[PDB]
Design a protein around this ligand. Structure first.
Ligand SMILES: *[C@@H]1O[C@H](CO)[C@@H](O[C@@H]2O[C@H](CO)[C@@H](O[C@@H]3O[C@H](CO)[C@@H](O[C@@H]4O[C@H](CO)[C@@H](O)[C@H](O)[C@H]4NC(C)=O)[C@H](O)[C@H]3NC(C)=O)[C@H](O)[C@H]2NC(C)=O)[C@H](O)[C@H]1NC(C)=O
Ligand SMILES: *[C@@H]1O[C@H](CO)[C@@H](O[C@@H]2O[C@H](CO)[C@@H](O[C@@H]3O[C@H](CO)[C@@H](O)[C@H](O)[C@H]3NC(C)=O)[C@H](O)[C@H]2NC(C)=O)[C@H](O)[C@H]1NC(C)=O
Ligand SMILES: *[C@@H]1O[C@H](CO)[C@@H](O[C@@H]2O[C@H](CO)[C@@H](O)[C@H](O)[C@H]2NC(C)=O)[C@H](O)[C@H]1NC(C)=O
Ligand SMILES: *[C@@H]1O[C@H](CO)[C@@H](O[C@@H]2O[C@H](CO)[C@@H](O)[C@H](O)[C@H]2NC(C)=O)[C@H](O)[C@H]1NC(C)=O
Ligand SMILES: *[C@@H]1O[C@H](CO)[C@@H](O[C@@H]2O[C@H](CO)[C@@H](O)[C@H](O)[C@H]2NC(C)=O)[C@H](O)[C@H]1NC(C)=O
Ligand SMILES: *[C@@H]1O[C@H](CO)[C@@H](O)[C@H](O)[C@H]1NC(C)=O
Ligand SMILES: [Ca+2]
Length: 964
């Protein structure tokens, strides 16, 4: 039968009291608070003024980037002067240029004008590779011969850069890379290191995003593809490959749209006006281009009239400078002077014409189109010419900024991208290098309107993370930074993996561009905060948001405070997220050499038998102490270091060490004085304590092998979840995993320690226990069933045919049930067990869901869809009547007040058949949002305001037709 709602409410109270009392007593919660008050005077509570913290960090980042920019400035000055003083030799006799080619074998045991250097690489932990600080290394790509007269002159005159490289490194020993990408192809980076590692080097410095960023200004490109009949066959494949490679040379500040025309022009993809060259809009355009067919009769006057009209659309967001048309055709007879006289008569749009394929057609008109319209003419006769002939239009685009003089020389920082030499997430500052031969005397300006190359220095994101310390904050507080496009420069949720672009089709060069809204859970207030950060404003915003847990299975409803300020000097904006309870932190005292030894003798490796197996967080306390992935090794190193000399020494962090020692003392006093009195308890398997300082202790020595949590305290999902909840939190175990399930370790319940010192509020630690399944399953089958109620069971027996007692958590996962089959599936989502009660619970708003996208995820055969369920109405009694096909299941649900637990009682599963559409909470591979709809309603961005797109002094004589 189905007992009364009052009866279920009476049953749940006994189990709630049992669980709450057992978790309270077993893991000391009042004892730690009492310890924290009674050992006062050993620490002090200091404020976290968010306004000051964010400004200090912003000025630190500003100084770092200005240090980085000074090196670029002096490199550019020296390179310009040295090239200006160069004399063009044409013949080199035996050894005349001495350089280290970065792709040469280190032991050849064996050229036209070059003598190799045999360098000595020692090591450097700052880089990870083997480097030589003695000289610079040269990369010359595979196609370009290293004996050319234009390469040997570069290799000679650029040898003067090594002194400046050395001077920069000696003034700032933290410089990572100093590359000079040259317009001839070769690159010179100062710490001479072998080139990376089939295995065909396809690297070209003239296509890397930093070079393209520094070589021109943002563009409004419109590719016009000819798809008439005559381009059928090889020419079409060359055209598609060329268009894809051209699309690869586009940044997020650039806007592009691809059109095609046989006899009537049309858009190749769903986009209709112009889209910024994201990593995903570009994918859509590439996929659309790879599916075009050639049929018809060419009509230039209808394709150009289409391109010029899409370059006039101002309802949409665009770069608003450098308006260019790239015509991919083979050859024709029409030049269409009327169209150009009608649309482009003041010559505000450049036209670049490509004669793709191996054929024999008139090429005069398409050369004339480039010559008349301030453009250039290119020829792609095979696959090997695609790269070079698609990367060259930047030479044309850089003329107006070269003529701008010492006003186009501004340092610009790129998007976050993976370094070529396996260094991780880095950003690059760039500065163009101009040609100034014959400028001291008024001699030459015809060829001087071309950059020599681009300077570049790399700053790693680990540097920026070092400038923003995070250990005076709670685990829930963090920094993050936003550039004008909205992408994150800093975020806890940014991983060193390429951004997924779509579902991975069956059978490291792209930037890691992750938007702020894609790194967190989007919110109406967050869309406003992000716009204010982009605009370059500063303010505070305290509001109730929706935070997702570390393990990506739960959601908590936390109250956070966003404080942001612009990184004055650059275009970035820094923000600091802090919850309400994280406005104060514990600062340890100096104490005395007596107390240091007594606290540090507790975490001796032989000593965690009377004290409980101890973990230590791998945070850098001293320069000499080395971080290890095996916590035993790091704990031994930490112990021997503390034994050596004194706990307080130079080349260390006094605050970190003192905090760790204070936490060790508090934890040891707790574990001894309380847990040592009661060696074994009936319903617990292990008592643990995790504290902010870095220390994790599990009381049973044998239970330490089952502890699978991260030794870093600031990265434990249960700690972060428990901080946001003023009650007990049940963390469901993992289901179908190689580790020990909820039969040898137990089910974890955690409660956050809250201490009231002065009027301040602090949460410095979290304790908990792992409840054994057997004691609780034995306690579950007797505290809810009445014995003399009836012959047939009025509630669940050990294996009840009809009754289906089952208790869930705040995320819909299984924790315990009556049935043996159910109990065998502890830690599984209830949707995959009973896929009808689950969806009805969602529908009657027992639960709620909120779905997001993961872009940095890996798949087996990629963007991934994620789902998390959370309590919404937060009211107690949930009873109703679920309807199956031609049958009715009646259910009652009651929620424990002190824990995030729900007791759901359903009449019977077998009696009434419902359709079994499984509701899966696990992450599912999926395509991202439809790009068409997103580009119909784009996000807010503030593009660069400086652009050099026209100059009256520019010489258009180098059209490219008469030059070959
Ligand atoms: C920065 O700008 C300066 C000037 O603005 C530039 O310096 C000039 O560099 C060119 C190299 O391209 C030198 O070219 C001279 O011109 C003669 C005559 O053409 C060349 O002799 C032949 O030229 C043909 C083509 O006409 C060609 O096949 C090949 O270059 C030569 N062939 C044979 C068989 O000899 C020479 O290349 C060269 N002459 C001499 C005597 O060196 C100019 O002389 C340079 N100008 C000045 C004022 O010195 C410089 O390259 C730019 N920076 C960079 C990095 O390119
Ligand atoms: C481009 O290549 C040129 C040829 O190798 C280099 O020019 C040569 O540099 C040498 C320095 O190593 C000069 O030697 C010195 O020159 C001084 C002149 O003041 C004289 O005393 C001597 O000739 C000599 N002295 C000493 C102490 O070695 C060569 O005169 C000079 N010119 C040649 C060989 O024709 C350029 O240095 C090189 N460019 C760059 C940027 O390195
Ligand atoms: C969008 O661009 C079009 C032209 O590219 C602008 O032209 C107007 O289009 C609307 C559509 O019904 C009409 O008011 C007229 O046909 C056009 N008005 C003119 C030319 O003055 C249109 O104004 C742009 N959108 C907005 C909101 O301004
Ligand atoms: C960028 O410049 C502004 C002003 O040029 C700095 O803001 C000033 O801060 C002082 C106190 O530090 C105030 O007295 C001024 O009123 C502020 N001026 C404003 C807001 O216009 C700002 O600090 C600089 N950027 C950074 C990161 O420090
Ligand atoms: C994200 O989660 C929030 C939290 O529930 C959802 O916002 C609520 O949505 C329900 C309807 O599903 C509304 O009745 C509430 O008024 C919403 N709350 C607030 C504060 O607005 C939200 O729908 C979820 N999904 C997304 C995409 O935000
Ligand atoms: C900037 O450089 C100076 C000297 O080059 C150095 O003392 C200072 O610490 C640097 N600031 C940084 C790296 O933020
Ligand atoms: Ca044709």
């Amino acid at each position: 039968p189905f007992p009364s709602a009052v009866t279920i409410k009476s049953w749940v109270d006994k189990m709630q009291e049992d669980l709450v009392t057992l978790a309270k007593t077993a893991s000391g919660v009042n004892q730690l608070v009492d310890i924290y008050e009674k050992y006062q005077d050993l620490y002090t509570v200091e404020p976290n003024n968010a306004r000051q913290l964010v400004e200090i960090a912003a000025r630190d980042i500003e100084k770092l980037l200005s240090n980085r920019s000074k090196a670029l400035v002096r490199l550019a000055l020296e390179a310009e002067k040295v090239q200006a003083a160069h004399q063009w030799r044409e013949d080199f006799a035996s050894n005349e240029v001495v350089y280290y080619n970065a792709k040469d074998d280190l032991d050849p045991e064996k050229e036209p004008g070059s003598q190799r250097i045999k360098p000595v690489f020692i090591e450097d932990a700052n880089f990870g590779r083997q480097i030589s600080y003695q000289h610079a290394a040269v990369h010359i790509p595979t196609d370009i011969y290293e004996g050319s007269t234009i390469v040997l002159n570069e290799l000679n005159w650029t040898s003067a850069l090594d002194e400046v490289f050395k001077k920069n490194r000696e003034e700032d020993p933290s410089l990572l890379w100093q590359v000079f990408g040259s317009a001839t192809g070769l690159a010179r980076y100062y710490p001479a290191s072998p080139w990376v590692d089939n295995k065909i080097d396809l690297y070209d410095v003239r296509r890397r995003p930093w070079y393209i960023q520094g070589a021109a200004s943002p563009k409004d490109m419109l590719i016009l593809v000819d798809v008439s009949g005559s381009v059928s066959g090889l020419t079409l494949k060359l055209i598609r490959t060329s268009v894809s490679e051209m699309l690869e040379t586009l940044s997020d500040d650039d806007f592009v749209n691809v059109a095609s025309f046989n006899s009537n022009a049309q858009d190749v993809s769903c986009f209709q006006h112009l889209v910024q060259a994201n990593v995903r809009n570009k994918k859509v355009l590439k996929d659309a281009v790879n599916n075009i067919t050639a049929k018809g009769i060419t009509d230039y006057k209808k394709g150009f009239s289409f391109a010029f009209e899409q370059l006039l659309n101002y309802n949409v967001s665009r770069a608003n400078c450098n308006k260019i048309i790239m015509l991919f055709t083979d050859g024709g007879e029409e030049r269409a002077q009327e169209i150009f006289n009608k649309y482009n008569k003041d010559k505000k749009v450049r036209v670049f014409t490509f004669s793709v394929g191996q054929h024999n057609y008139d090429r005069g008109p398409i050369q004339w189109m480039a010559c008349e319209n301030k453009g250039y003419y290119y020829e792609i006769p095979s696959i090997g010419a695609i790269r070079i002939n698609t990367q060259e239009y930047l030479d044309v685009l850089g003329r107006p900024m070269v003529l701008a003089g010492d006003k186009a020389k501004q340092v610009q920082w790129t998007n976050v991208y993976l370094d070529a030499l396996e260094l991780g997430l880095v950003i690059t500052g760039t500065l163009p290098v101009f040609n100034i031969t014959g400028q001291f005397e008024n001699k030459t300006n015809l060829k001087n309107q071309l950059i020599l190359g681009v300077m570049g220095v790399d700053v790693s994101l680990e540097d920026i993370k070092r400038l923003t310390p995070r250990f005076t904050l709670c685990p829930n507080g963090y920094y993050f930074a936003i550039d004008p496009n909205g992408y994150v420069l800093l975020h806890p949720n940014l991983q060193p993996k390429p951004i997924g672009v779509g579902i991975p089709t069956i059978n490291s060069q792209e930037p890691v561009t992750l938007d702020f809204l894609d790194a967190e859970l989007e919110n109406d207030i967050k869309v406003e905060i992000r716009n204010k950060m982009i605009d370059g404003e500063s303010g505070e915003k305290t509001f109730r948001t929706l935070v997702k847990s570390q393990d990506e299975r739960y959601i908590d409803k936390g109250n956070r405070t966003y404080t942001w300020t612009p990184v004055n000097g650059t275009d970035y904006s820094l923000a600091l997220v802090l919850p309400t309870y994280s406005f104060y932190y514990i600062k340890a005292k100096l104490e005395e050499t007596i107390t240091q030894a007594r606290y540090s003798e507790t975490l001796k490796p032989d000593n965690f038998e009377e004290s409980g197996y101890t973990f230590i967080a791998p945070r850098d306390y001293c320069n000499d102490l080395k971080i290890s992935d095996n916590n035993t090794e790091f704990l031994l190193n930490f112990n021997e270091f503390i034994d050596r000399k004194t706990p307080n020494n130079p080349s260390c962090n006094a605050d970190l060490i003192n905090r760790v020692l204070l936490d060790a003392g508090f934890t040891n006093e707790l574990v001894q004085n309380y847990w040592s009195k009661q060696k074994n308890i009936k319903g617990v398997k292990a008592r643990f304590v995790v504290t902010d300082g870095g220390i994790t202790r599990v009381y049973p020595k044998e239970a330490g092998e089952n502890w699978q949590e991260n030794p870093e305290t600031y990265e434990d999902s249960f700690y972060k979840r428990s901080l946001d909840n003023d009650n007990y939190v049940f963390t469901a175990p993992y289901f179908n995993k190689s580790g020990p399930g909820a039969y040898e370790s137990g089910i974890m319940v955690s409660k956050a320690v809250e201490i009231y010192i002065q009027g301040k509020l602090l949460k410095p630690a979290v304790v908990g226990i792992k409840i054994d399944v057997n004691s609780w399953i034995e306690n579950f089958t007797k505290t809810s069933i009445r014995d003399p109620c009836a012959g047939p069971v009025c509630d669940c027996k050990r294996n009840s045919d009809v009754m289906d007692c089952v208790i869930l958590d705040d995320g819909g996962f299984l924790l315990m049930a009556n049935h043996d089959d159910y109990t065998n599936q502890i830690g599984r989502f209830f949707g995959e067990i009973d896929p009808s009660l689950m969806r009805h619970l969602v529908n009657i708003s027992v639960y709620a869901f909120n779905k997001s996208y993961d872009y940095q995820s890996v798949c087996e055969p990629c963007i991934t869809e994620q789902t998390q369920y959370f309590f919404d109405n937060d009211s107690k009694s949930f009873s109703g009547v679920l309807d199956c096909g031609n049958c009715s299941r009646i259910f009652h649900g009651e929620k424990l007040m002190n824990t995030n637990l729900i007791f759901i009682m359903v009449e019977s599963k077998g009696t009434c058949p419902c359709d079994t559409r499984l509701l899966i909470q696990a992450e599912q591979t999926s395509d991202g949002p439809n790009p068409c709809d997103m580009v119909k309603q784009p996000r807010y961005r503030k593009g660069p305001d400086v652009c050099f797109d026209n100059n009256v002094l520019e010489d258009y004589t180098d059209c490219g037709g008469v030059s070959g």
